[PDB]
Amino acid sequence: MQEGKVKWFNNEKGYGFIEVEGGSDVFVHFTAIQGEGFKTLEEGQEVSFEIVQGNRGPQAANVVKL
Amino acid sequence: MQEGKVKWFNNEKGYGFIEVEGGSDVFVHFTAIQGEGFKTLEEGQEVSFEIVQGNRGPQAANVVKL
Ligand code: NA
């Protein structure tokens, strides 16, 4: 588990990227977003998350807005 | 996706396993469950899901109650 910030997120398509200090960007899909409410993220939002490896490569899991 | 049947799920602990015919049971955590319903599952419940690799090995992602 670790922290990063949302780099960008396309609300219509429901995906974007989390930027990591000193590391590679991590893909995030709306299905990973935790909590109640409409599943979206805004640029600059601080998040915690896990990285998992799927058939398309690394992606975020368990994305919590801080 | 992929289909399976919940083998067991402990709603206090927040996890269980999904049985996959002719394959290994897959760990499922509550954070993977989709929908506005309670993030719980029950024995025998049919689900669709993605297998991803986490730091402890294979686990379910994108778990939808059918
Ligand atoms: Na970076």
Curated annotation (Swiss-Prot), chains A, B:
Pfam families: CSD. GO terms for molecular function: DNA binding. It is found in: Cytoplasm. Gene3D superfamilies: 6.20.370.130, Nucleic acid-binding proteins (2.40.50.140). It comes from Bacillus caldolyticus. One of its GO terms (cellular component) is cytoplasm. It comes from the Bacteria. Affects cell viability at low temperatures. Its main location: cytoplasm. CDD domains: CSP_CDS. This is Cold shock protein CspB. Induction: In response to low temperature. Keywords: Activator, Cytoplasm, DNA-binding, Stress response, Transcription, Transcription regulation. Homodimer. SMART domains: CSP (SM00357). Residues 4-63 form the CSD domain.
